């Protein structure tokens, strides 16, 4: 399991040695917005048995969960 560290444009030392399950990473923003909220994603944790609404992240068990910025997502 891996998780692009920051990504944005270039790239860094990906792969999450610890917590073999999900690589966290979500965002912030106010509400649904879908435009502003210029923030970032966490980055691996261990698991996400939780299921809360507003927080910052849940879990990212993949190899490309890191989405795009807020301003210009695409």
């Amino acid at each position: 399991i891996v998780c692009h560290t920051t990504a944005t444009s270039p790239i860094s030392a990906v792969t999450c040695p610890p917590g073999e399950n999900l690589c966290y990473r979500k965002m912030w923003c106010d509400a649904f917005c879908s435009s502003r909220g210029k923030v970032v994603e966490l980055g691996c944790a261990a698991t996400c048995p939780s299921k809360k609404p507003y927080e910052e992240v849940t879990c990212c068990s993949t190899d490309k969960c890191n989405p795009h910025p807020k301003q210009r997502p695409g």
Binding site: T6, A7, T8, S9, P10, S12, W28, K38, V39, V40, E41, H68, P69, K70, Q71, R72
Partner: peptide, 18 residues
């Protein structure tokens, strides 16, 4: 005590696109 620090962080425009 002046700082004007940024609340949250930012994704785009990191610093390596240098």
């Amino acid at each position: 005590y002046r700082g004007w620090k940024h609340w949250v962080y930012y994704t785009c425009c990191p610093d390596t696109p240098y």
